[PDB]
A paper describes a structure:
In mammals, [name] is expressed in lysosomes, where it is critical for maintaining lysosomal homeostasis. To begin to understand the mechanisms that underlie [name] function in lysosomes, we determined the structure of [name] by cryo-EM and identified two conformational states. [name] protomers consist of two homologous repeats of six TM helices, which assemble into a dimer to form the channel. A 2-fold symmetric ion conduction pathway runs along the center of the dimer, lined by two copies of TM1 and TM7, the first helices of each repeat.
The resolution of the putative open state improved from 2.64 to 2.45 Å and the closed state improved from 3.03 to 2.61 Å. In the closed state, the isoleucine constriction formed by Ile46 and Ile271 is too narrow to allow ion permeation. The side chains of Ile271 point toward the channel axis, narrowing the pore to a minimum radius of 0.2 Å. For the closed state, we can now model three ion-binding sites and 25 water molecules into non-protein densities. In the cytosolic region of the pore, where the channel undergoes minimal conformational changes during gating, the K1 and K2 ion-binding sites and water molecules occupy almost identical positions to those resolved in the open state. In contrast, there is little correspondence between the ion and water configurations at the isoleucine constriction or on the luminal side of the pore due to the conformational changes that occur to the channel during channel gating. The inward movement of Ile271 displaces the ion-binding sites on either side of the isoleucine constriction. Movements of Thr49 and Thr274, which both coordinate water molecules in the open state, result in a movement of the luminal K5 ion-binding site toward the luminal entrance of the pore. Thus, the higher-resolution structures reveal how changes in the protein structure alter the ion conduction pathway to prevent ion permeation in the closed state.
Residue numbers in the entry:
A (entry chain B), B (entry chain A): 30 to 174, 254 to 476
Amino acid sequence: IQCSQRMLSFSDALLSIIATVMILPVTHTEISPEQQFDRSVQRLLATRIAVYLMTFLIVTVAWAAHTRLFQVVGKTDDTLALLNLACMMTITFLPYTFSLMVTFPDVPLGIFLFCVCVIAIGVVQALIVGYAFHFPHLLSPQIQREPLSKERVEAFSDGVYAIVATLLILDICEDNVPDPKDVKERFSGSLVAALSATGPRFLAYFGSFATVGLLWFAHHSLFLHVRKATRAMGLLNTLSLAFVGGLPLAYQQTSAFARQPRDELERVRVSCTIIFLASIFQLAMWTTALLHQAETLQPSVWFGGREHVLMFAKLALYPCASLLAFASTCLLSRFSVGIFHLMQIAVPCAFLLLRLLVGLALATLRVL
Amino acid sequence: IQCSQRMLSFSDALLSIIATVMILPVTHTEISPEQQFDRSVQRLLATRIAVYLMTFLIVTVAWAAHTRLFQVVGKTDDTLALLNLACMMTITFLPYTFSLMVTFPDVPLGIFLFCVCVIAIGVVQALIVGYAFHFPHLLSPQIQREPLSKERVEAFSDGVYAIVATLLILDICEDNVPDPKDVKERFSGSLVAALSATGPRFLAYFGSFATVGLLWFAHHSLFLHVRKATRAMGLLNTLSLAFVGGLPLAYQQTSAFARQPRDELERVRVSCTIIFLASIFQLAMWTTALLHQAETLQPSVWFGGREHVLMFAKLALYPCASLLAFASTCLLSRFSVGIFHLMQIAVPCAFLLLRLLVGLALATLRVL
Ligand SMILES: [K+]
Ligand SMILES: [K+]
Ligand SMILES: [K+]
Ligand SMILES: [K+]
Ligand SMILES: [K+]
């Protein structure tokens, strides 16, 4: 009998990428200036965002069902591996059916194909269960004779984060790659001078990537001290990942969404809201785990623990900064863009010096 | 001190996706019929293919250096995690510099940025080494006082395979999603009738996905019996993955490459060549491991072992079928397309029945 760890890792990667794909249409929404005040186009954009959210949630539900199934199964086999590949294929077919239904919501074809795909997933998983139970040695020892699998959650989250960070660089690679017919005209053939138009732009990439990379760093930190992953924690993680997938929306440059008519205040508000939603659910995961620390958290991060305050600050850094920037957009709009840039530059430094800042604050409050 | 396994998994995912991204420009090659006989466009397409190969190899070299580094380090830390994030950011910046150099190969800007990025990677890794050695408890026990890390190779391969399988479905989602203004004209508003143009197309997806999914299944099988991963095996795996990344080229539909002028024989030959190159290097990995079976392979797959013939057949199935199809394109061109479709339908069945076919063949040869 074979060890199923790599097969489950492959499934996690596939499903995470599949869930995150549907943000691409959102980033490719073109709004002409003539349609800036057209409510129909704005409604279409909102509908496409809702479609992305629904598809992410559906793929996550399928992934959770798969996780249940292969917690029940445990071991794998050639036949089981091929059946898992068939299940992954059927699941990956879901975005196509959902897109077809979106294009023609009033025709039965989309609903019919979606139902057929769901039934196919069900039948494939039932076949997997039947094969596993027909050979008892392929079952988990407890079954051979609820909690979530932490590694599956971590792999799914890593896939989502990596895909977002990749979409950023794909956007950059197209933003600032001029052609000879463009450089010879805009800059009289001096490519170096094109830095004046491209220098800052790719520099902005460094700011965006960090925002994702540090968010993962928070997640990576939290689950280093997580013992038991509860279903509520899984749901909160799913919401956090769903809102993480929208970071390219607030950070991409070539994206049609980025080229829509807008103002600085609106863009800053949207980016701050997306970051706040992404991070507040990680903070909610941590708070939820704190209620049952005895069974969900390592002793170091329990109340009064050595790592407690550090973890709390690490997870609350982004929500507080995002909320402060959003408030500044309303109270100090004239300098809100500068404050947002300052936040982008400072939050990584705060993460780097976090262990010193926390101790300094603790000592200052103790003496005072 | 923290466990570095998840950080390395995240790095593997990032680097694998980054390596595979550069196939997207290749799939977006638009060749008008007026330029079918224009040698310049064909040369440009070949140059972009070579650029994709070079970028994949460079990203793989960076990933291998990172693997060496964090085999030396072993344990991780908050500062080490942030430094690893910085290193990943610098590495992800490589595609942008390579693309800029490609656009203007005769200007120093591209080479200058590429050199700056490489030096940045070097300095970041040197800082990681210095920090790790300044705190001896963050070093591996042997160092605290060559072989490859199998899990890193497996994670990188899984990332590449998942990205290819995802690119397939992204192509499909755009191939066969008509709009009302298109359905009302081409099919008089009968969306169901559009199956006549869309039915087979997404059906073809099922054929393409399997081809990737089974290739992974072969890889997944081989490394289940691999003890020690040698550097030569790593190089062969890198070549196999590089040629796997070109599967969307031979299987995508909307891709401008797919819409280029062509003939059935040429497309079949290209697809067969790509599949053959992808699988022959897995077979080469297996053969290379066989030379040092005592140190690289589990006893079950040694010469004369129970699983030996099964593994050999599993890894040689695709190369033989691809070579036979390619030969048919020259000897039986009139039926080569049908033979290719038959191969696409049959190879999964051969994989499913492999354990029976191998035994049947062995018995038949023994009695005869
Ligand atoms: K994993
Ligand atoms: K992944
Ligand atoms: K892994
Ligand atoms: K992956
Ligand atoms: K992509």
